[PDB]
C-alpha cells in the first residue's frame, strides 16, 4: 500500500532527476573556451622555506591579511608563522596528536583544531594575559573529524566520518543543526563567501550541497569511481572542485548538477591529497602522491606547470587572499612558498 | 642587524627561541616506544590491558625497565580503515590479541564461519598491507583453560574438516599456532612471535620487551651492512 506507492514515487523521481542531469549537459567547458590563449609556462620558484617541523604536515590555512600562516603536524604542534620575515608568531601545543584540519578566523582572533578524537577545539589569539589559551571543546560527533571552517566569531561548521555534518554555536556549546543523508565517510567541506551554502564530499563517490540555516540538503552529486579526499570552492560561488583517489580531479557546478571538467594524466596513477584555487580563478593547484604539485589550467585542462622540490607526498596547499603567493606543505616536514 | 629596525630584532629573537623549544621537544619525542594494539571484539583486549596494568583513539602509557611505552588502543572506532591507519606506519610493533576458546561459536548466519575465520582474515589483511612490510607482529593467544575444558567434551573438526590428530590440548595448541604463523608471505623481512597467556603471567609484557629489543637490533645490524 503505502510502501509500494513510496517506492514507485522514489523510482519516478530518480528517473526524472537522471533525465534532467542528462539533458542539462549540452556541452563541456573544453568545447567552449577553445579560443582562449594559453597561460604558457609558469616557471614559479621558491622564495622562502619554513623549517622546524619534524613529522608530516597535515593542514595549513591562510589569514585575511595575506601575511600570517598556521600549520599543524603530528608532533603535537600548531604554529603561526610570519611569511615575510620567515618568523614565528605563535606556537601552540595540543593534546590530541592526530590532527587533520586547521581553521583561522577571518578576524584574526580564533583558530581551530580537529582530527581523530571527535572533538573540535577552538583557541583564542588576542588575549590579554599573553598566551593562546583554550576556550571551547565542541563535542557531539562519533567519528574522526575531517575539516572545520569558521562562519564568524560565533558560528562553526564541522564534518566527520559518520555521514554527518554539524552547524555549531561556540557561546552555548550546543549543536544547532545536524545534516544527514550521506552513505559513506565524509572527508571535507568548503564554505561560500556569503555563509549561506556549503558543499561536502563523502567516501562514497558523492558530494552534496546544503543550505546553512534551514538544515536540509538541496543537492546531490555523483560521477566519481572512488572516494573524495579534498574539496574547495570557487570564489564567485557558481562552481567547485573535488579531488578523488582514482587519479582524477573534477570541477562541478552548484547550479547545473553535472560532472563538468576532469583532470588526469596517464603518467599519474596516484592520489589527489589536496586541491586549491587562486584569487582570479585561472589556476587549479593540485597536490599529488607522485611527490610534486601540478598547476593545471583551471579552464582548459589541457596543460600543467609543475612545482617539485619535495622528498615525499604532498598533503596540503593554500593561496593568499590577494593572490601574492602559494604555499605547499608535504610529508618531508618542509613548507614552501612560491611567488 | 645594522639594517634592521629597532623592533624587528625582538621578532627575530622570538622566532629563534621558539625554534629552540621545538627542536628540544621533537628530540625528546623520539625516545618512547610506540605500539599499536588490535583484536576482534570480546577477544580479551580488556584482559590484556588489565593484566599488564596500563571516543576515537584511546592512548595509554606506562614505564618499565627505564623505557616509556605508549600503546594506541584503537578498537573504539567503527569507521573505514583505509584512512586512519596510514598515520601509523612508524610504530615498532603491532600487538594482535585473539583467544583459542572461540573455535565453535558462530558470529553470523553461516555456521562454518566461526570467530576464528574472522580473526584469521583480519590477520591476513594486516600482514600483507603496504604500510607494514617492515613491522614485527606479536600474537597473543588467550583462553587456554576453557579450551581444554571444552575439547575434553567436544571435537575440533567442527571448524577444521581436514584435521587428523589427537584430541588433546597439546596437538590442538600446536595446530592453532602453526595455522596462525603460516600466513606470512615474506619471512625474509617480517617475523611473527607467539606467547600463551595465563592469569598469573607477570611476564605478559616481558615478551613484548624482548620482541622490541630484537627488532631494534635487527634494524641496527642491517643499516650497517653485516
Amino acid at each position: 500500500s503505502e510502501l509500494d506507492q513510496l517506492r514507485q514515487e522514489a523510482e519516478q523521481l530518480k528517473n526524472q532527476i537522471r533525465d534532467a542531469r542528462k539533458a542539462c549537459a549540452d556541452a563541456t567547458l573544453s568545447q567552449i573556451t577553445n579560443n582562449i590563449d594559453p597561460v604558457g609556462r609558469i616557471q614559479m620558484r621558491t622564495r622562502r622555506t619554513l623549517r622546524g617541523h619534524l613529522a608530516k604536515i597535515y593542514a595549513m590555512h591562510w589569514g585575511t591579511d595575506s601575511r600570517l600562516l598556521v600549520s599543524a603536524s603530528q608532533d603535537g604542534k600548531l604554529i603561526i608563522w610570519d611569511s615575510y620575515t620567515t618568523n614565528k608568531v605563535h606556537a601552540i601545543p595540543l593534546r590530541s596528536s592526530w590532527v587533520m584540519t586547521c581553521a583561522y578566523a577571518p578576524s584574526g582572533n580564533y583558530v581551530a583544531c580537529g582530527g581523530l578524537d571527535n572533538i573540535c577545539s577552538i583557541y583564542n589569539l588576542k588575549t590579554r594575559e599573553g598566551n593562546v589559551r583554550v576556550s571551547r571543546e565542541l563535542a557531539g560527533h562519533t567519528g574522526y573529524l575531517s575539516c572545520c571552517r569558521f562562519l564568524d566569531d560565533n558560528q562553526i561548521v564541522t564534518s566527520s566520518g559518520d555521514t554527518t555534518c554539524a552547524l555549531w554555536d561556540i557561546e552555548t556549546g550546543q549543536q544547532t543543526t545536524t545534516f544527514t543523508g550521506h552513505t559513506g565517510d565524509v572527508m571535507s567541506l568548503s564554505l561560500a563567501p556569503d555563509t549561506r551554502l556549503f558543499v561536502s564530499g563523502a567516501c562514497d563517490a558523492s558530494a552534496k550541497l546544503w543550505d546553512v540555516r534551514e538544515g536540509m540538503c538541496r543537492q546531490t552529486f555523483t560521477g566519481h569511481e572512488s572516494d573524495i579526499n579534498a574539496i574547495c570552492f570557487f570564489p564567485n560561488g557558481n562552481a567547485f572542485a573535488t579531488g578523488s583517489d582514482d587519479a582524477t580531479c573534477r570541477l562541478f557546478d552548484l547550479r547545473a548538477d553535472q560532472e563538468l571538467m576532469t583532470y588526469s594524466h596517464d603518467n599519474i596513477i596516484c592520489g589527489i591529497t589536496s586541491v586549491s584555487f587562486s584569487k582570479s580563478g585561472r589556476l587549479l593547484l593540485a597536490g599529488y602522491d607522485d611527490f610534486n604539485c601540478n598547476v593545471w589550467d583551471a579552464l582548459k585542462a589541457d596543460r600543467a606547470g609543475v612545482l617539485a622540490g619535495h622528498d615525499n607526498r604532498v598533503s596540503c596547499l593554500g593561496v593568499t587572499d590577494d593572490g601574492m603567493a602559494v604555499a605547499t606543505g608535504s610529508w618531508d616536514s618542509f613548507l614552501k612558498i612560491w611567488n | 642587524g645594522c639594517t634592521l629596525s629597532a623592533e624587528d630584532k625582538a621578532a627575530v629573537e622570538r622566532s629563534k627561541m621558539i625554534d629552540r623549544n621545538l627542536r628540544e621537544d621533537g628530540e625528546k619525542a623520539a625516545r618512547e616506544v610506540k605500539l599499536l594494539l588490535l583484536g576482534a571484539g570480546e577477544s580479551g583486549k580488556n584482559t590484556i590491558v588489565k593484566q599488564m596494568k596500563i571516543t576515537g583513539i584511546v592512548e595509554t602509557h606506562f614505564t618499565f625497565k627505564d623505557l616509556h611505552f605508549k600503546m594506541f588502543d584503537v578498537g573504539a572506532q567503527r569507521s573505514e580503515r583505509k584512512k586512519w591507519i596510514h598515520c601509523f606506519e612508524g610504530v615498532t610493533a603491532i600487538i594482535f590479541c585473539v583467544a583459542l576458546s572461540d573455535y565453535d561459536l558462530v558470529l553470523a548466519e553461516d555456521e562454518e564461519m566461526n570467530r576464528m575465520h574472522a580473526s584469521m582474515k583480519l590477520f591476513d589483511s594486516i600482514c600483507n598491507n603496504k604500510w607494514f612490510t617492515d613491522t614485527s607482529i606479536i600474537l597473543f593467544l588467550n583462553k587456554k583453560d576453557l579450551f581444554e575444558e571444552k575439547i575434553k567434551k567436544s571435537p575440533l573438526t567442527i571448524c577444521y574438516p581436514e584435521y587428523a590428530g589427537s584430541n588433546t590440548y597439546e596437538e590442538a595448541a600446536a595446530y592453532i599456532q602453526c595455522q596462525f604463523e603460516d600466513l606470512n608471505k615474506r619471512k625474509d623481512t617480517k617475523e611473527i612471535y607467539t606467547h600463551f597467556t595465563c592469569s598469573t603471567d607477570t611476564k605478559n609484557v616481558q615478551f613484548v620487551f624482548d620482541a622490541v629489543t630484537d627488532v631494534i637490533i635487527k634494524n641496527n645490524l642491517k643499516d650497517c651492512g653485516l
Partner: single-chain antibody, 230 residues
Framework: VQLVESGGGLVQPGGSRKLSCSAS????????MHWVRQAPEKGLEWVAY????????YYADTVKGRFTISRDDPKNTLFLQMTSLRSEDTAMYYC??????????????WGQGTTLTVSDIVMTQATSSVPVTPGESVSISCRSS???????????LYWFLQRPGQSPQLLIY???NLASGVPDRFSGSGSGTAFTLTISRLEAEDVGVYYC?????????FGAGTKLEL
C-alpha cells in the same frame, strides 16, 4: 594584569638601592620590559630596556656603569639596581611591558611607579598650556628632529595621556591605532616630522598632560608635553 612596583624612597647622593617590580595576572616570560622616569615638575625620559631570554640590554647616555637591569622569571620579577647617585637623579619611575611580534601593541600597560628623591633625535612640543571647553574640538601637535618613517612602512610615534594623580595610559601606537579601553572619539595622524592628535567632544577626566614619543632607534626620547586644563 597587575604590575606592582616597590623599593623607592629618599637617599643621599651615592649609596645604592634596588627597585623591584612584581607581576601578577599574565605570562611574565613572553614580554620584554622597560623602565621610564618622570621629572617632579616636567616630562618623561627613557631609562633602560631588557628583553626576552636576557639576551639584549640597552641603556641611555647618562646611565651606564651605574644601573643594572635583570629579570627573575620563576618568581615573575624585574630588578633595577642603582649606585653612586646625584641630585640630578630625583624622579619617579615606571615599569612598562611590551611584546614585539607582527601586529602587536607595545607599551600597552603601565605601572604605578615609585618616588625616588635625592638631596640624537629630540621632540619639540608646540605649547605648554591651551584652554578648553566641554563641547568643542581640540588638537595638539609636536615635531621630531629627524624623520621617523622607517623602510618597512612603520612610523614610530607613541601618544600618551596622564590625568591628575594617576599613571600614564596608552592612547596611540604607530601614529594611527587605538589602545585598549579607549573611546573611538580620539584620533591622530602625522606627516613628515609634524604630528597631530585630535580629541572631539571633550569630557571630564579628559583634562591633563599629553606626551609624544619616538621609537625608531635607541635611545628613546620624550618631549615636554602639553596641557588641557578646565
Amino acid at each position: 594584569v597587575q604590575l606592582v612596583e616597590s623599593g623607592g624612597g629618599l637617599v643621599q647622593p651615592g649609596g645604592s638601592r634596588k627597585l623591584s617590580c612584581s607581576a601578577s595576572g599574565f605570562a611574565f616570560s613572553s614580554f620584554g620590559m622597560h623602565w621610564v622616569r618622570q621629572a617632579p615638575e616636567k616630562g618623561l625620559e627613557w631609562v633602560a630596556y631588557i628583553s626576552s631570554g636576557s639576551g639584549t640590554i640597552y641603556y641611555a647616555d647618562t646611565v651606564k656603569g651605574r644601573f643594572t637591569i635583570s629579570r627573575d622569571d620563576p618568581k615573575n620579577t624585574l630588578f633595577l639596581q642603582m649606585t653612586s647617585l646625584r641630585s640630578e637623579d630625583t624622579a619617579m619611575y615606571y615599569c612598562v611591558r611590551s611584546i614585539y611580534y607582527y601586529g602587536s601593541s607595545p607599551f600597552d600597560f603601565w605601572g604605578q611607579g615609585t618616588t625616588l628623591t635625592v638631596s640624537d633625535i629630540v621632540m619639540t612640543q608646540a605649547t605648554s598650556s591651551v584652554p578648553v571647553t566641554p563641547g568643542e574640538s581640540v588638537s595638539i601637535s609636536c615635531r621630531s628632529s629627524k624623520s621617523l618613517l622607517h623602510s618597512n612602512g612603520n612610523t614610530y610615534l607613541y601618544w600618551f595621556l596622564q590625568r591628575p594623580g594617576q599613571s600614564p595610559q596608552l592612547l596611540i601606537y604607530r601614529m594611527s591605532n587605538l589602545a585598549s579601553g579607549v573611546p573611538d572619539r580620539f584620533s591622530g595622524s602625522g606627516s613628515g616630522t609634524a604630528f597631530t592628535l585630535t580629541i572631539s567632544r571633550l569630557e571630564a577626566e579628559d583634562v591633563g598632560v599629553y606626551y609624544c614619543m619616538q621609537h625608531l632607534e635607541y635611545p628613546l626620547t620624550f618631549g615636554a608635553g602639553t596641557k588641557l586644563e578646565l
